[PDB]
Write a protein that binds this DNA or RNA. Structure first.
Ligand SMILES: [Mg+2]
Ligand SMILES: [Mg+2]
Ligand SMILES: [Mg+2]
Ligand SMILES: [Mg+2]
Ligand SMILES: [Mg+2]
Ligand SMILES: [Mg+2]
Ligand SMILES: [Mg+2]
Ligand SMILES: [Mg+2]
Ligand SMILES: [Mg+2]
Ligand SMILES: [Mg+2]
Ligand SMILES: [Mg+2]
Ligand SMILES: [Mg+2]
Ligand SMILES: [Mg+2]
Ligand SMILES: [Mg+2]
Ligand SMILES: [Mg+2]
Ligand SMILES: [Mg+2]
Ligand SMILES: [Mg+2]
Ligand SMILES: [Mg+2]
Ligand SMILES: [Mg+2]
Ligand SMILES: [Mg+2]
Lengths: 152, 101, 165, 87, 166, 309, 107, 98, 138, 89
RNA sequence: AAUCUUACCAACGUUUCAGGCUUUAUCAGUAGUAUGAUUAAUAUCAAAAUUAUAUGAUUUAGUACGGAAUUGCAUGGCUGUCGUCAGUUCGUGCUGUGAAGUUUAGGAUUAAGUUCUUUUUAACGAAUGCAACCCUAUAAGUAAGUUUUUAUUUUAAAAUAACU
RNA sequence: UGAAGUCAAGUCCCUAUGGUCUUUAUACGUUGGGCUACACACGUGUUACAAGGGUAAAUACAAAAAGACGCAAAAAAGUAAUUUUGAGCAAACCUUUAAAAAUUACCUUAGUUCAGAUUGUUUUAUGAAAUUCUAAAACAUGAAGAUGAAAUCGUUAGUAAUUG
């Protein structure tokens, strides 16, 4: 009765994220930038609600990860005609998060109906968009719950 | 009558709607025609009907909604060449930046 | 959109005094020759002064642009040249002082075509400059408009530019 | 060279209409002898028949014979008048 | 100081008048303009939930105020989660507490229900067999109708031919 | 040749992109698309907005529209109607026809309205009996059978006063071109046990011969009933010719044979059809050309190739 | 010309669909067939069948979703627009030509 | 994989063991290094830097030797870009004056 | 990164017909009946229950025409309730085909419909149809 | 004329929010084109009074120069239109 | 540039708005389509089957007709090149009758109107550009780590191999 | 990343626009054709004239980028192009990607096991459609060319060149 749950969340955020050691110290030649600050509300969720999390139903092992990826839009000609050299390039930069945390459980849910597949997955994941900010929006999301079905 | 853009957008529109609805028809006919295991006749009678249709709504070619110019298009944005040089001045394009590798 | 909405017809947090004082009158004395040009548009004097200060503060290219277009259209195509010489002095001398207060820095405005002329007559280019308009400063900020004016002689394109901190 | 054999040869809407009108016995005439869509292959039933083929702003004439079968209409007709550098 | 404000979420309807009688003189867009403060429409909320948009904004420049919206959004997340997490505890708590019975199987839309009504000579062709597979499994795009309507167009090619066509 | 051609212009119509629905709000005093699940949550919020707010102000529109929808969706709400009937004095002899239709339509179908609530709308429906549409009046007949608050007698006297002049005057245009306006009417009467000869005359001229009767369940139930009136002899006018036409449809059309019996008088099951799976009764079914259009040419095609022999 | 030469190899070119003898099936063959009913797989020879064109995905409507935006032409997507000023300039300039056209017709 | 069975030719092989002569600790140790990226010659010269940096943690006496042989310095030198109107980095179209 | 595919010469060509390997079809036997199966689960009185693990995804992008992106429903199934013999295991590794499978669990995916419910029940109809056809062996 | 290459895009991603802040994946074409359809609907809905239009013709029946000039909106001065996305909102 | 594209040539055909709104008149067993016939093709005609889905299909008048037709020596807008050369220019003050110059002339330095200098009874300051801030590759230091990254190590089960 | 502005440089034929012209035609839709013609000649660029090469067989290491009107592993067939088949993935998770070189062996300076055009005929792929007017593979055809006059161009280190 310590069945495991798996939740993997991805985000998108165009601007650079900032290191938390770098708030009191940062070079004035870089101070006028933009950053996607406050990308850590995900971590904060498991400290405010630490008192509400029961012992039957408890999160643990929450971790983040960073990546970067460029998409290519193409080199577009800059003139109306007869200038092949004139090409201004265009591209797109992104930064993805990858949250991943487990929550244990004493329960194990039973299934007896199709509608139960909707009561537990489809209503929650569609209502998971709250876990979001303006710049930090989410592409995908995952939930894994062990279950029981009485086939035959 | 209509100016060139608002006309030509409709031509390239009606060509797709035809395809959208004769989709299932033209996928089954073409399925039989390439089914080598069948006799040749039924493979041909489908080829006979497959041509007995409006080809005019099949000669599709891309177009830009804004300029009316057809040859160069950015599929990532769905708009043209003469326009992106303009919007890039205004910065209207979202999340784009100049590649400095 | 299949999604929830909230629309916010908000206003600016800025307001103006109720009492005339010196610092209004100092502007009215300088902006007098424009009053003739201003009456053609049925535009008031009080309102024109405000929108610029809203513009220097709020940094919205769209607002101060429409003020021009209502003037530059109601006028006749002889008189555009003078209106700008009064606009150059107005920005360059009077309002150049407000810049450092509002963390504001830079103005630039470039016309294109037949600002005043008829039939077969040359192009002319007019400019306005004050403060900083740099482009290789990737850490400097900007906002950019590319505009259009119609006449009986032809067409005129204008480029507003602006910069702030 | 040509297509693979299993890719059956092309005969458009039109010639399929004409082959049927042959089958009924309806003779070929001013407009029925007319041909377009040259890529359509030259069928076998229509031996002993004239067909006025189209190019540009006028036409060409031919009769069908068993040797002409299998080919395409547009391989017998010339579109571009040949080029000769003058003296 | 922050101006006054209004909020309008579907209670709009109750105040609404007929269309046979409306103010032809005064327009809403004018009322929005001449009336002080600010005005807000939004699609609605629950009792436990906060307005999405911050009702007030410190600055007026775009660049300098948008962080006030990030702070607001994060400031909004919490009551929605206690409503979410609390349910996610409760639903699971029902199901392990429910009793098990056999899985109450239910109906799927499939094309085989039409296939097994057709006679042999259609069912035995390589065509219609290969139809009912790929239109059943590898094509979710289509309705239950558009697939059944596809066989009957394929079954026509099971039939023989006249001598004209041949 | 013209551009655009008519066959093209239908493409944009069949997909539905020719409309602009916000214009409908100015045409209909009630307008609630519910084209999305978010929009539906906007409905439930109203229902909780009322239960929580005992003190509440309204207009005549927002009241009547909510009832129209709850009736249309069929949600049960014994608490909503008593809360809203209080205000009905506010809009006596004032409401539009379209709105007077709604709360009327909902009071019947709800099976929850008061005899005072129904009394308020019946005075208004009559007050606008001319401008009201025919298809609207027909849906009222669909609700009399679904309501049980009233006795069927009062529903009939109300049907003779206000509803007959609508339909009979607006028969040739609003109803006659349409089959759906007729079918729901013909079903709506027998379920109400009302039989007037001013209508069944006007109705039966057209129904049994239409192509619009595409669903066999629409064909059959007309055949199910018209065979019964003969047994009872209720209607005086002869009907024998009408019924024979429906039999020929039920026989000739190969679908009806595959789903229905005249003699056994029922539909087939799914299992029973598998028994008749391989029984191929059809005669001379095959790929063809000109057959049902011009079979003369097929005969010529036999002569020519025979002459070559 | 058509140079043909003899192929000293024999027999049908083998295939899963051809190794099968439905009258005499092995255990490994009934098992695969029992998978095909489940997931809808296909068994066919080395030669082409039409399943590759029944399994394909062909989404033409996604282009219409661009044509249905009507961002490029507001009047086609939002007919309540009425460009008042642009019509005024269009009318003034026309009428002034007609002054010129008639006055030049005399002159 | 095995040493002779991955780095086939010996000039790829002496590079990686050039430090091991400079240490004189031959056969004392057992080596296991995992590499991914680049081509064979560039994939070998990295093995100089890694052992030379690995040994000096053990034998810091060997440092001024590895300084002289430049086995501890990286090679930031990396391939250049293809400009637009150039066939590649530093290669332009033919100039035409007539 | 990915290393490149290479066709190694595993088997030599010309090896005598007598020295080759050939393996019979172990699945050739008399298949079980139904009551033989039900007699195995007498501890549970005609009732079997399976432990499984349901993955599922959602997207903010699944809308007007990409609304089909939310149709997959990935599942795993645990086997230790399945008292699988040596012959029952190999039969099960064939039905799945060239698909993932371990001693502990195996995958099951369906993307046959638009709505995930219909793709979820189909997994149950597969799990049943695979357990029976698997336990039809001894 | 010397080539003043694209200044704003050289500055945007590192020093300036774009005219809107949202982002999307697999739906870049819709939102980028659909908000442009809404920037100008609202402009042309406000800067030109259309509530007076929707009354006269769209509605059945059973000042004019004053509107074509938009005299009622002569004091109106818009600054921007902005768009956002998060939390399904 | 296979068709479309494509503007050009030849020929058949069309004669004024796509959607929305207003309006005139007729039809409603009529209307429509993965239908059928017809033409080279758009077009045009129509009841064997099928669809019937609220408030129709067709028609008159009106709601900015149209134009790759011309003048880039009437213009915008976009762009090439002189040139990645290092210059262009303003406010005030000084000098000269004045044009104008100084500043932007000396010394050195710089790839650079680059920077430094106490060259001077006169220039001080300011904008733009070059530069630099930003991105790629590097070492050193900190911060985070994935069922997806890589390696060292370890727990438990199955197969294979070994045999404790 | 690129100032001021010059070359009345270029474009009204991407879109906008002033003047001018046309409006039963300088406008519009469709079918077919044409832009792919061939005396002489120019600019650009790929492949070769060989042995630091060609070929057969066995068989290593990459980056960057893209993916559902898609990528498509594993097994199997074919001589080969490629096809059957579609596990798995909307993603650092699954997938699409190397050659030159190095090793072993033959060819032994020959207009040649170099070169590889051109042409005939089947097969392979897309499409409604390949003749005018597509690309690729095989059997077979197997021309010129034997490092190029006067003249002239690119390059400054991870550059030239070579490899994909
Ligand atoms: Mg094409
Ligand atoms: Mg395949
Ligand atoms: Mg062409
Ligand atoms: Mg053409
Ligand atoms: Mg023309
Ligand atoms: Mg010129
Ligand atoms: Mg000087
Ligand atoms: Mg690089
Ligand atoms: Mg890096
Ligand atoms: Mg010229
Ligand atoms: Mg050309
Ligand atoms: Mg070579
Ligand atoms: Mg090999
Ligand atoms: Mg692989
Ligand atoms: Mg393979
Ligand atoms: Mg699959
Ligand atoms: Mg080699
Ligand atoms: Mg030779
Ligand atoms: Mg050779
Ligand atoms: Mg030689």
């Amino acid at each position: 009765m310590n069945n495991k749950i798996y939740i993997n969340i991805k985000y998108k955020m165009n601007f650079n994220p900032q290191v938390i050691n770098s708030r009191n110290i940062l070079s004035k030649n870089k101070s006028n930038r933009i950053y996607c600050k406050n990308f850590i509300f995900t971590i904060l969720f498991f400290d405010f609600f630490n008192s509400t999390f029961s012992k039957n139903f408890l999160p643990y092992k929450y971790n983040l990860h960073i990546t970067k990826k460029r998409k290519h839009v193409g080199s577009i000609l800059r003139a109306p005609y007869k200038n092949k050299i004139a090409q201004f390039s265009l591209g797109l930069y992104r930064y993805f998060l990858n949250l991943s945390f487990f929550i244990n459980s004493e329960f194990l849910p039973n299934i007896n109906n199709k509608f139960e597949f909707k009561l537990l997955f489809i209503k929650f994941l569609n209502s998971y968009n709250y876990f979001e900010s303006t710049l930090v929006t989410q592409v995908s999301r995952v939930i894994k719950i062990p279950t029981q079905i009485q086939i035959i | 009558m209509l100016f060139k853009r608002r006309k030509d957008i409709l031509k390239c529109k009606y060509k797709k709607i035809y395809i959208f609805k004769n989709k299932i028809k033209n996928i089954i006919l073409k399925s039989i025609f390439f089914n080598r295991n069948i006799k040749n006749i039924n493979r041909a009678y489908a080829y006979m009907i497959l041509n007995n249709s409006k080809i005019l709504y099949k000669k599709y070619h891309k177009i830009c909604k804004f300029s009316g110019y057809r040859k160069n298009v950015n599929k990532f944005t769905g708009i043209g060449r003469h326009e992106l040089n303009r919007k890039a001045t205004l910065g209207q394009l979202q999340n784009i930046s100049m590649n400095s590798w | 959109l299949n999604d929830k909405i909230s629309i916010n017809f908000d206003k600016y947090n800025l307001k103006f005094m109720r009492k005339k004082r010196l610092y209004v009158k100092v502007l009215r004395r300088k902006l007098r020759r424009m009053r003739k040009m201003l009456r053609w548009a049925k535009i008031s004097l009080r309102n024109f002064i405000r929108l610029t200060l809203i513009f220097l503060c709020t940094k919205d290219i769209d607002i101060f642009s429409k003020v021009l277009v209502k003037i530059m259209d109601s006028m006749h195509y002889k008189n555009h040249r003078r209106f700008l010489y009064y606009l150059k002095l107005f920005i360059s001398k009077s309002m150049h002082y407000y810049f450092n207060i509002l963390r504001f820095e830079g103005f630039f405005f470039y016309l294109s075509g037949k600002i005043s002329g008829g039939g077969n007559s040359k192009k002319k280019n007019y400019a306005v400059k004050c403060g900083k308009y740099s482009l290789t400063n990737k850490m400097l900020k900007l906002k950019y408009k590319k505009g259009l004016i119609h006449t009986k002689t032809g067409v005129l394109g204008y480029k507003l530019m602006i910069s702030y901190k | 060279m040509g297509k693979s054999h299993w890719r059956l040869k092309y005969i458009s809407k039109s010639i399929i209409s004409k082959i049927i009108k042959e089958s009924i016995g309806i003779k070929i005439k001013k407009k029925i002898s007319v041909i377009m869509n040259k890529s359509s292959t030259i069928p076998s039933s229509l031996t002993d028949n004239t067909f006025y083929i189209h190019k540009g702003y006028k036409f060409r004439e031919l009769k069908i014979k068993d040797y002409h079968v299998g080919f395409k209409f547009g391989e017998f007709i010339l579109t571009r008048k040949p080029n000769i550098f003058p003296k | 100081n922050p101006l006054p404000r209004l909020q309008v979420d579907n209670t709009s309807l109750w105040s609404l008048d007929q269309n046979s009688e409306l103010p032809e003189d005064t327009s809403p867009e004018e009322q929005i303009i001449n009336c002080e403060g600010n005005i807000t429409f939004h699609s609605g909320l629950q009792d436990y939930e906060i307005p999405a948009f911050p009702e007030t904004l410190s600055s007026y420049i775009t660049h300098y105020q948008i962080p006030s919206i990030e702070k607001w959004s994060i400031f909004r997340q919490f009551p929605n989660m206690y409503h979410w997490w609390q349910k996610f505890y409760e639903t699971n708590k029902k199901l392990s507490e429910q009793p098990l019975v056999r899985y109450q199987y239910s109906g799927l839309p499939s094309v085989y229900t039409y296939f097994y009504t057709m006679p042999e000579f259609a069912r035995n062709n390589i065509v219609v067999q290969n139809v009912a597979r790929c239109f059943e499994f590898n094509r979710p795009e289509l309705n239950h109708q558009q697939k059944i309507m596809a066989l009957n167009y394929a079954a026509k090619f099971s039939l023989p031919l006249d001598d004209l066509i041949v | 040749a013209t551009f655009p051609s008519k066959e093209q212009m239908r493409f944009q119509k069949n997909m539905g992109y020719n409309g602009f629905q916000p214009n409908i709000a100015f045409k209909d005093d009630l307008y609630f698309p519910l084209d999305n699940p978010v929009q539906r949550q906007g409905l439930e919020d109203l229902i909780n907005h009322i239960k929580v707010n005992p003190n509440l102000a309204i207009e005549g529109r927002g009241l009547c529209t909510i009832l129209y929808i709850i009736a249309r969706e069929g949600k049960d709400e014994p608490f909503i109607f008593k809360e809203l009937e209080r205000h009905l004095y506010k809009f006596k002899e004032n409401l539009s026809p379209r709105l007077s239709f709604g709360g009327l339509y909902a009071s019947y179908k709800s099976n929850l309205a008061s005899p005072y609530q129904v009394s308020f709308f019946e005075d208004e429906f009559t007050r606008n009996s001319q401008q009201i549409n025919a298809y609207e009046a027909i849906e009222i007949l669909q609700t009399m059978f679904e309501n049980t608050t009233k006795v069927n007698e009062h529903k009939i006297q109300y049907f003779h006063q206000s509803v007959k002049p609508i339909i009979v005057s607006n028969f040739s245009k609003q109803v006659r071109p349409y089959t759906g306006n007729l079918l729901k009417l013909f079903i709506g009467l027998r379920n109400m046990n009302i039989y007037d000869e001013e209508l069944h005359e006007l109705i039966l001229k057209y129904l049994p011969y239409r192509r619009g009767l595409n669903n066999v369940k629409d064909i059959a139930e007309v055949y199910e009933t018209l065979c019964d009136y003969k047994e009872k002899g209720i209607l005086k006018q002869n009907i024998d010719a009408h019924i024979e036409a429906l039999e020929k449809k039920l026989t000739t059309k190969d679908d009806c044979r595959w789903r229905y019996n005249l003699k056994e008088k029922r539909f087939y099951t799914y299992d029973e059809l598998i028994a008749n799976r391989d029984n191929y009764t059809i005669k001379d079914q095959l790929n063809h050309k000109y057959r049902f259009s011009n079979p003369e040419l097929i005969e010529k095609f036999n002569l020519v190739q025979s002459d070559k022999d | 010309p058509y140079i043909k030469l003899p192929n000293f190899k024999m027999g049908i070119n083998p295939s899963l669909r051809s190794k099968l003898n439905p009258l005499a099936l092995t255990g490994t063959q009934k098992i695969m067939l029992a998978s095909s009913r489940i997931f809808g797989t296909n068994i066919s020879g080395n030669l082409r069948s039409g399943n590759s064109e029944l399994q394909k995905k062909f989404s033409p409507e996604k282009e219409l979703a661009e044509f249905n935006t009507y961002a490029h032409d507001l009047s086609s997507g939002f007919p309540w627009v009425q460009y008042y000023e642009q019509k005024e300039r269009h009318k003034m300039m026309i009428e002034l030509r007609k002054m010129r056209i008639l006055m030049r017709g005399i002159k | 994989e095995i040493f002779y069975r991955y780095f086939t030719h010996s000039y790829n092989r002496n590079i990686a063991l050039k430090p091991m002569l400079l240490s004189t600790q031959y056969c004392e140790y057992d080596l296991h290094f995992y590499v991914r990226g680049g081509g064979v010659m560039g994939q070998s010269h990295a093995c100089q830097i890694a052992l030379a940096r690995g040994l000096t943690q053990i034998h810091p006496n060997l440092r001024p030797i590895f300084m002289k042989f430049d086995l501890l310095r990286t090679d930031y030198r990396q391939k250049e870009r293809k400009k637009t109107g150039r066939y590649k980095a530093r290669k332009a179209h033919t100039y035409v004056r007539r | 990164s990915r290393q490149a595919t290479v066709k190694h010469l595993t088997k030599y060509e010309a090896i005598p017909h007598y020295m080759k390997q050939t393996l019979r079809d172990p699945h050739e036997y008399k298949l079980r009946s139904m009551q033989q199966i039900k007699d195995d689960l007498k501890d549970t009185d005609g009732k079997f229950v399976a432990r499984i693990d349901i993955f599922y995804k959602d997207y903010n992008d699944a809308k007007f025409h990409e609304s089909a992106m939310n149709k997959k429903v990935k599942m795993n199934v645990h086997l230790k309730n399945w008292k699988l013999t040596h012959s029952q295991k190999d039969r099960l590794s064939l039905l799945l085909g060239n698909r993932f499978m371990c001693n502990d669990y195996f995958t099951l995916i369906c993307d046959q419909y638009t709505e995930p419910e219909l793709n979820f029940e189909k997994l149950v109809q597969q799990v049943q149809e695979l357990y029976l056809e698997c336990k039809r062996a001894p | 004329m010397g080539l003043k290459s694209l200044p704003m895009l050289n500055k945007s991603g590192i020093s300036m929010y774009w005219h809107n802040i949202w982002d999307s994946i697999k739906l870049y074409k819709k939102y980028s084109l659909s908000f442009l359809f809404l920037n100008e609907v609202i402009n042309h809905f406000l800067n030109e009074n259309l509530y007076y239009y929707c009354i006269m013709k769209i509605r059945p029946t059973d000042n004019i120069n004053k509107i074509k000039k938009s005299w009622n909106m002569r004091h109106f001065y818009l600054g921007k239109i902005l768009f956002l996305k998060y939390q399904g909102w």
